[PDB]
Design a binder for this molecule. Structure first.
Ligand SMILES: [K+]
Lengths: 72, 955
């Protein structure tokens, strides 16, 4: 599926069904580090992603690169 | 190729290349291998823009760069349209539009996205050149709305604009022309999007924190800084006026005009903005009421005698809000009044939702009854409020605390400036030999000089704003609308102005009424806060001093005069007599003839408005009496100031409006008891008012001579400042007493002219003779003759006019034999020579008195002296029993004198017995009386006996 890049480069491949929410994605990305889903922002193709939206509704296919940001 | 052109259009529009190390600005793309591939085109565009914004360099203004990419994009589309293959490049421009806008949203949604700058710098760039960012911003707004993230946008933009206004400009105020305009343009751009308008009040810091101090509402709240934009801000006033305070009138006027033109545009724009909020949704409009109510609630000391200015909202903020609230109220108060019933008269029947009413004095009720009224009255869960009704009473709240605090601030400035000039003048005299002391004195001069410049500049700016007729008209029209509303609340039918209101509400009362009157005060009106009446009237009195006053020639003026006359006609409505004092003072300003001698500006209404012409005369004659019972009370709006104000109106009504002249004559003929009560009061004040005026005028001289001393006694000099206080105080009281004396005497002259017989009935005629003769003695003797002040007009002191009026009264009553007789019998003052001296004095002001007038006065005096001569002849020849031995009704020597307990008259036991036989009253004052209650006058009985024995010895 998808690739999640940091600011300073640094990639984290997540396997997602085109159905789980972006809150579910974050909870997965958060799990894949040592942080809370609340500190994670996601930015894809000219927009911030939203907790309610399904990876499907976002227009994400496999191979795609999405920026993540970690917070305070 | 055509795979070129696209690639190169992308290069020129994002200003970026890869291999490429030549020719134009463009940043060489660093450094990833994935973007090293020397094609380019449509799907590399995200990558490129991500490089620009996250990867850095000194792309130090990321958001400015986005805007330019967007401009450059629009540019290229236009240039491409008119060339062979516009189509082929369409996919390219779309992708750039798509992503530049998209990331523009992102940049204005989360703080750390780009790694140069933050919201504050992006907003600063926007404020600096808003017109350049506007098309892009509009696309940004629209994109966020469409993706369901508008509030994220607003919470980055608007709180950031707060900080920009408090921290990045030295003063966000009218002086910062470009900046304040661009800030307004930002609000307008956003708030014109309806989905933005509906949630705007949900922005962080839209409301004030709980701990936010009142002066900080205008600084720490989303709308504060823009709402505070006004020419009556100190820094603005100093810049525009403190500039050259010695300017001509012509020169000051042009400054007023630019500032008014500018202030008008600001109110228009603030109103457009807030009206969007109000229309956005029930939430937004309720939150606005809430926001304005909180500001009002924490600003009550704005009306204290010495407001703590630094702990309160500013005049500019509060006045601007007042005008916006006025503007929201206009529609339901237009002259047709068809929407007037939308405002709930029972607004205060429930406990108040937004306005804090704790500590607010009511019109005719105390805390006790009002809280009781809430209990009985209630109104259920949720139940409230209605925007229109919230807005209307909030407007009244601001008129009092907002505008009202602004006009009192300005009113006191004349005195502040004069005191300040005097302190500076004194400190300028100090010879400071010691360097430290010399630095001290100059720091003190310089601090006072700064305060003086600030105050003088603000007086100008405030004058500019109150002379601004276009703005003040709105305030006064609100007042007139509010007046109609309030007459509608009082009406038992609640039908006015569609049907006339019938006054009086309760039959007129033929010793402690307060309780009765409160008990019959109308509900719910008696519970309305005093501020609903204090606001209009303070405003109206104050704004009268302006040439461009919104009151002068305003066709709605009628409504306010109507309300005023109602309030003066029905003592029940408003218990506070200082309030009524202000109201009558307002009517008197309306009655004052204009500089060219034409009727005062309210004369027309007094004449033609039915509710007024039916009620004002009675109202004035009744109020003239009632003010006596002013228990606790003090000047101004003193009983004497009120009587003075009433006299002006009475006198003008009688000169210029025949219908009021007839109503006056009518009251004297057909309602004598009411009318005599007014006259007795007028007469009684006239026994002391000249004395009081002279005495105060002599206390001025005592004080002035104590000041002059210089070798010093002190014979006591208490405190020099207390002397100036005592000197101003004696000056006030001198003017107020002489002024009233002049007016009362003139009322005696003009009335006695038409209804001489009202002035000659028993209860008036002896007291009148006594009072006229006494006042005559001052005017023609040393009481007036030894008084020498500079400019006696300063003190309404015209002994010549008062003498002229006084002597005319004698003339006007000169054919009433009861008067001729009362004057002839007044042993205390009467003396023919007083009239000779009057004639000699009147002839010292040429034209004061005609020869015809002089002959008339002398015919009068001659008749009086001749009545007195006849009386004394009658007594020498026929008055062989001393008078106090004679029964008062039977004229014969008393056998058994007794004292009546009510009248204290002596009368013979047989006479009172014969009286009480058929009529159970004191025959002199009609007081209930039983024979048991008379008291033997033994002392008197012994004189009569001694007397009868003296005479028995001759016969
Ligand atoms: K009407």
């Amino acid at each position: 599926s998808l690739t999640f890049k940091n600011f300073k480069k640094e990639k984290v491949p997540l396997d997602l069904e085109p159905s789980n929410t972006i809150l579910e994605t974050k909870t997965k990305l958060a799990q894949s580090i040592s942080c809370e889903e609340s500190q994670i922002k996601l930015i894809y193709s000219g927009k911030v992603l939203q907790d309610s939206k399904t990876v499907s509704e976002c227009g994400l296919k496999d191979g795609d690169q999405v920026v993540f940001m970690v917070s305070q | 190729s055509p795979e070129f052109r696209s690639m190169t259009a992308i290069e020129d529009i994002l200003q970026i290349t890869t291999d490429p190390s030549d020719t134009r600005g463009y940043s060489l793309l660093k450094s990833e291998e994935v973007p090293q591939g020397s094609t380019l085109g449509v799907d590399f565009i995200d990558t490129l823009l991500l490089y620009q914004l996250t990867e850095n360099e000194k792309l130090d203004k990321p958001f400015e760069y986005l805007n330019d990419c967007f401009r450059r994009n629009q540019q290229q589309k236009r240039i491409t349209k008119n060339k062979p293959n516009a189509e082929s490049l369409h996919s390219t421009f779309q992708e750039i539009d798509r992503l530049v806008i998209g990331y523009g949203v992102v940049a204005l949604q989360i703080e750390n996205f780009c790694m140069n700058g933050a919201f504050i710098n992006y907003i600063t760039g926007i404020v600096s050149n808003v017109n350049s960012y506007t098309d892009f911003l509009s696309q940004i707004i629209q994109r966020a709305i469409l993706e369901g993230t508008a509030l994220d946008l607003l919470n980055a933009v608007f709180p950031t604009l707060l900080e920009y206004c408090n921290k990045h400009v030295s003063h966000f105020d009218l002086n910062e022309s470009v900046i304040y305009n661009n800030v307004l343009t930002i609000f307008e751009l956003f708030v014109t999007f309806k989905p933005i308008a509906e949630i705007f009040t949900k922005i962080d810091g839209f409301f004030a924190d709980y701990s936010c101090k009142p002066q900080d509402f205008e600084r720490k709240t989303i709308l504060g800084p823009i709402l505070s934009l006004s020419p009556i801000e100190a820094a603005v006033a100093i810049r525009n006026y403190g500039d050259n305070l010695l300017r001509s009138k012509q020169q000051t006027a042009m400054i007023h005009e630019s500032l008014q033109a500018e202030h008008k545009v600001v109110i228009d724009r603030l109103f457009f903005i807030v009206d969007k909020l109000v229309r956005g949704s029930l939430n937004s409009r309720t939150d606005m009421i809430s926001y304005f109510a909180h500001i009002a609630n924490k600003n009550h000391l704005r009306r204290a005698d010495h407001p703590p200015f630094k702990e309160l909202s500013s005049n500019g903020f509060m006045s601007n809000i007042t005008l916006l609230l006025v503007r929201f109220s206009q529609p339901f108060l237009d002259i047709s009044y068809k929407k007037i019933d939308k405002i709930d008269a029972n607004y205060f029947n429930n406990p108040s939702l937004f306005i804090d009413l704790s500590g607010e004095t009511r019109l005719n009720s105390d805390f006790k009854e009002a809280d009781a009224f809430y209990d009985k009255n209630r109104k259920t869960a949720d139940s409230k409020p209605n925007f229109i009704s919230d807005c209307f009473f909030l407007t009244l709240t601001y008129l009092h605390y907002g505008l009202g605090g602004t006009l009192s601030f300005e009113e006191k400035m004349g005195s502040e400036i004069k005191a300040l000039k005097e302190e500076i003048e004194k400190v300028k005299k100090i010879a400071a030999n010691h360097d430290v002391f010399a630095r001290f004195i100059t720091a003190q001069l310089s601090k006072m000089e700064k305060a003086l410049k600030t105050t003088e500049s603000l007086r100008f700016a405030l004058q500019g704003f109150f002379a601004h007729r276009s703005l003040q008209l709105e305030v006064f029209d609100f007042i007139c609308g509010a007046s109609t509303f309030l007459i509608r609340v009082v009406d038992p039918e609640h039908e006015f102005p569609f049907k006339q209101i019938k006054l009086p509400l309760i039959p007129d009362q033929i010793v402690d009424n307060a309780d009765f009157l409160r008990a019959h005060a109308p509900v719910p009106f008696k519970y309305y806060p005093e501020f609903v009446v204090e606001g209009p009237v303070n405003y109206s009195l104050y704004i009268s001093k302006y040439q461009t006053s919104p009151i002068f020639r305003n066709p709605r003026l009628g409504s306010f005069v109507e309300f005023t006359t109602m309030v003066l006609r029905c003592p029940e409505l408003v218990s506070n007599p200082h309030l009524k004092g202000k109201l009558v003072q307002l009517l008197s300003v309306g009655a004052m003839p204009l500089t060219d001698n034409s009727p005062g500006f309210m004369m027309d209404i007094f004449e033609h408005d039915e509710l007024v012409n039916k009620n004002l005369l009675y109202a004035l004659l009744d109020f003239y009496v009632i003010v006596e019972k002013t228990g606790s009370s003090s000047q101004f709006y003193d009983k004497f100031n009120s009587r003075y104000s009433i006299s002006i109106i009475l006198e003008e009504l009688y000169y210029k409006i025949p219908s009021y002249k007839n109503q006056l004559i009518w009251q004297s003929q057909n309602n004598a008891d009411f009318f005599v009560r007014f006259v007795a009061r007028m007469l009684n004040d006239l026994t002391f008012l000249l004395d009081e005026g002279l005495s105060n005028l002599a206390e001025v001289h005592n004080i002035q001579n104590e000041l002059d001393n210089r070798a010093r006694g002190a014979p006591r000099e208490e405190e020099d400042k207390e002397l100036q206080t005592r000197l101003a105080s004696a000056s006030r009281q001198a003017k107020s007493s002489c002024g009233l004396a002049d007016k009362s005497m003139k009322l005696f002259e003009i009335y006695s002219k038409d209804i001489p017989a009202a002035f000659v009935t028993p209860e008036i005629v002896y007291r009148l003779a006594s009072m006229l003769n006494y006042n005559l003695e001052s005017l023609v003797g040393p009481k007036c003759g030894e008084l020498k002040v500079k400019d006696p007009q300063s003190y309404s002191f015209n002994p010549k006019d008062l003498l002229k009026a006084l002597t005319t009264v004698y003339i006007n009553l000169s054919e009433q034999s009861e008067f001729i007789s009362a004057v002839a019998k007044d042993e205390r003052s009467f003396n023919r020579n007083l009239f000779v001296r009057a004639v000699d004095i009147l002839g010292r002001k040429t034209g004061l008195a005609s020869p015809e007038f002089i002959e008339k006065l002398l015919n009068f005096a001659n008749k009086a002296e001749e009545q007195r001569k006849a009386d004394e002849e009658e007594d020498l020849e026929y008055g062989d029993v001393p008078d106090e031995f004679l029964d008062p009704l039977m004229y014969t020597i008393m056998k058994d004198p007794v004292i009546l307990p009510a009248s204290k008259m002596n009368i013979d036991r047989s006479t009172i017995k014969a009286h009480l036989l058929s009529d159970s009253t004191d025959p002199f004052n009609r007081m209930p009386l039983k024979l048991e209650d008379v008291t033997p006058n033994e002392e008197l009985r012994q004189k009569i006996l001694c007397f009868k024995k003296q005479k028995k010895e001759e016969a």
